[PDB]
Design a protein around this ligand. Sequence first.
Ligand SMILES: [Mg+2]
Ligand SMILES: [Mg+2]
Ligand SMILES: [Mg+2]
Ligand SMILES: [Mg+2]
Ligand SMILES: [Mg+2]
Ligand SMILES: [Mg+2]
Ligand SMILES: [Mg+2]
Lengths: 141, 162, 162, 141, 162, 162
Amino acid sequence: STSQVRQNYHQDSEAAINRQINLELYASYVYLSMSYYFDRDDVALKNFAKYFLHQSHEEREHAEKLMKLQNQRGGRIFLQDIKKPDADDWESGLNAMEAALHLEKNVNQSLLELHKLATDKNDPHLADFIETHYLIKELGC
Amino acid sequence: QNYHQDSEAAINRQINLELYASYVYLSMSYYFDRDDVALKNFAKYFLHQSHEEREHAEKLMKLQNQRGGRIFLQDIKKPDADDWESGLNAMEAALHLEKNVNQSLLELHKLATDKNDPHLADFIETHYLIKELGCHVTNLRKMGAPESGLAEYLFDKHTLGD
Amino acid sequence: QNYHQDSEAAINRQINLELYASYVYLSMSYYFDRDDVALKNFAKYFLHQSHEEREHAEKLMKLQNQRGGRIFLQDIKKPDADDWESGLNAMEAALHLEKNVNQSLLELHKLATDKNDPHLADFIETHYLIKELGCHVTNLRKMGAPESGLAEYLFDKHTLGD
Amino acid sequence: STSQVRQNYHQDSEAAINRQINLELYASYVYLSMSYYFDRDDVALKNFAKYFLHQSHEEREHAEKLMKLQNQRGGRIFLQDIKKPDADDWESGLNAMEAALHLEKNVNQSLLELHKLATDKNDPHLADFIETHYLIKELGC
Amino acid sequence: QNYHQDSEAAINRQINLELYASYVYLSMSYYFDRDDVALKNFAKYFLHQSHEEREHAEKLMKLQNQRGGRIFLQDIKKPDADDWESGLNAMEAALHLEKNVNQSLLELHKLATDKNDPHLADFIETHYLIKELGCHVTNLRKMGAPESGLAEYLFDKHTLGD
Amino acid sequence: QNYHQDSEAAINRQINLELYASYVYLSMSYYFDRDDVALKNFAKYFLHQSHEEREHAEKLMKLQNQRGGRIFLQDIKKPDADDWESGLNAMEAALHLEKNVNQSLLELHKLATDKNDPHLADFIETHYLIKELGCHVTNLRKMGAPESGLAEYLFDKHTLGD
Ligand SMILES: [Mg+2]
Ligand SMILES: [Mg+2]
Ligand SMILES: [Mg+2]
Ligand SMILES: [Mg+2]
Ligand SMILES: [Mg+2]
Ligand SMILES: [Mg+2]
Ligand SMILES: [Mg+2]
C-alpha cells in the first residue's frame, strides 16, 4: 500500500518525478549521441564532443538525484523505455546546438511545472529541492 | 563484402545491450535504496556496476567510430522488473543477464576475426563478473535467503562492505 | 495583523515539540542502558539524537528572539513509555514521533511565508531522519526483531557501531 | 541609394539584423530591470543582482557588435523604441529565471533563423558571424 | 505627505531621460561609423558618452532603491534622427539634448531638498558637458562646417584624437 | 565527380586574382613615389597591401598542394593604368578591384562546401579591407579631393601616417 516514511507527498508529485526521471535520462541519451557524432572523423570536433559528453554525464547524475528524492519521500520509482534520440547524423555542429536548446528548455520548463505543482500541494521540501536543482543547473559556471 | 556491415551491426547491438545492462543495475541499485528494502551495500554494488556497463558502451561507441562504422542507437528498454523482490533474486537476475550479454559479445568477437582483438579485453572481465555473481548467489542461498531477511542483512555487511 | 502572533505561537509550540522530542530520545537512550536491555549503540544513537533535538529547540529560541517575539515555555511532558520493549519498538516510536513533529514544523513554515526561509534548513533534515528511521525499522523487522534478540544484538553491532 | 561597400548583402538580412539589434537591446533592458529588483531590500539577493547586471551589459555589447556588422556591410541601422519590459516586480527569484529562459531562447532562436536566412542567400560572411556569435553566447563559460 | 512619491517619480523620470540620452549617443556613434560618414573619433566620442549616460541611469536606479522607492521603467524612445547629417549637427543636437535633460535634473534636486544632496555630483558634471559641447559646436562652425567636409575631418583628428 | 577539378580551377583562378591584385597595388605604390606625385604614406599603404595580397596567393598555393590539386599559373596581366591620377582615384580603384576579387572568392567558398572552411579566414578580412577603402574614399571626397591637392596631402599625413 503506502510507505512508512511518506508524508505530504502528493500522488501527483510522485508521478511528475517519475516523468522527470525519464526526461533527464532521455536528455543524457541525446547528449551522448551528439557527443560521439563529433567524435567521428567525418566531423572530428573534439571540443563539441567533450562538451556534450560532459552534459550527458550531468543529465544522468540529475536523474539519480531525482531517484534518490523519490525514495527519500516514500515515492516509488517506475522507469520507462529511454527512447532513441530522434537523429543519428546531427549534420552541422550548430544543428546540434539548436536541438540542445529545445531539449534544454523542455527539460527546464518541466522542472518549473514541477515547482508550480510543488507550491500548489504546499510541499516546501520538494519545492526547495527543485528550486536549488534548477539554479545550479543554470548558474553553476 | 558483408563483414563491415555485420561487424557494424554487432557493435551497434552490443552498444544497446551494455546500455540496457547499465539501466538494469541502475534500477536494481535504487530498489535497495527503498526505505522498505534498505540494503545500502546492495545499492552501492549495483550502482557501481551500472557505471561499469556504461563505460563499456562508450568504448564500443569509440570503437565503431575508429572502425569507420556508424553508430545507430535504439530505444533502451525498461528492465523486466520494478520490484526485484530480494537481494538473492537481484543477483540471480544479474547472473542471468550477464550470461546472455556475454553470449552475443562472443559472436561479435567470433565474427570480428580482428588483428587487434578489440573488445576481447572486456570479454575477459565478463567471465570474472559471472563467477562473482555465481559466488554471490551461492552464498546467499546457503545462508538462507531470500526468506531469511537476516541472511541478506549480514551479506550486505560482511561481503559487500569491502 | 494576526501573523506576528501566529508566527510567535507556532515557534512557541515548535520549541516545546523539539524539547519533548529531546526528552523522548533521552528516555529511550537510558532504556538501552539498562542491565536487562544492554544495547550500548542503541543507547548512543538515541542520546546523540537527543542532543540534536535540543540544539534545534535553542535555534527556535534564538529565532523567536530575532523576530522580536516572546518565548513562552510550557511543561515538557513525560514520554508515553518508561519501558520501550525492544529496539524495533523504540525505532517505530521515533519514526512515529518524528513524522508528527515534522507535520507541525511544516505549518510553521507554511504560515511563515518568510523572506529568509528560517527553519527550512532544519525542516530539510527531518526528512533525512525519517528515511533513516524507516531504513532502521525495516532492517530490524526483516532480521526478525523484536522477538529475535539476536537480530537486535547484531544490528546494534553492525549498523549502529559506525 | 546604395552603399559603395555593399556586396552580397540581401535586403532581407539587413532587416533581420535591424530587428536583432532591437531584440538584444530589449534583452539588455529586461536584465537591467531584473538586476535592480534583486537590489532592493525587499529582496536583497546580491548574487542574482550581480548575475543579471552582467547579462545586461553583455546583451548590450552584442547589440553593438550587430551594429558594427551592419555598417561593415553597407547596411543601414534603423533603431526602434526599446520597449518597457513586461514587469516591474519579478516577484520570486525563480520567476525571474523563468522569464529569462523564454527571453534567452527567443533571442537565440532569432539568431538561428538569421543563420538560416544567411545560408539561404549564400552569405558565408554573415553565416559565419552569427554562428561564432551564437556559440560564444552559449559555450563561453 | 506627497514628497516621497514626487521624489520617486522624478527619479523614475530621470532614469528614463538618461537612458534615452545613452540611446541617442549610441545612435550618433554608429552614424559616424557609416562608410559614407567615416569619422572614427566622432564615433568614439559619442560611444564613450553613451556609456557615461548609462552609468548615471544605474546610479539613479541604485539611488531610488536606497530611498526605499520603486523603480518604474518605461519605453526608451527612438531618437529623433537616424541620419545625423553632419558632425556639427550631431553636436548641436547633443547640446540641445543635454540642456533639457539638465533642466529636469534640476527640478529633481530642486524638490529633493535632501540632506545628502544626492545626484548633485552628477548635476555638476552636466554643466561641464554643456560648455564642452558648446566649445565643440563653436569650433566646427568657425572652421566652416558643416559644408566643409575638411573642417570636420580635421576636427576629428585634432580635437577628438586625444 | 567534377568537384575536385572545379575546386582545383577556382583556386587556380583565385591564385591569379590575388597575384594580379598584388601587381595593382605595387603599381599604385610607386605612382605615389613619383617626384610629381609625392605622397609617401600613400606609397607605404599600397606597398604594404601589395605584400598582403601576395601572402594570400601563396596560401592558396599551399592550399591547392594539400588538396592534392595541381597549380596552373597564368600570365599576371598589367593593371589598367600607369597613371593613377590622384589619391582618391587610386582608392576608388582599389575598392572596385577588391570587391570583384571578393566576389569570385565567394564562389570558391560557395562551391568548396569544405569541412575545414579553408580560405574563409581570408574571405573575412576582404570585408574589413572593403569597409576601410570605403572610409578612405569617403574622407578624401568630403575633404575636397581630388582637385584639392591639400586634401590628399593632409590625408596622407593624418590618416595614413599611423
Ligand atoms: Mg538535468
Ligand atoms: Mg544556458
Ligand atoms: Mg557487459
Ligand atoms: Mg525535530
Ligand atoms: Mg545577446
Ligand atoms: Mg545626463
Ligand atoms: Mg584579396
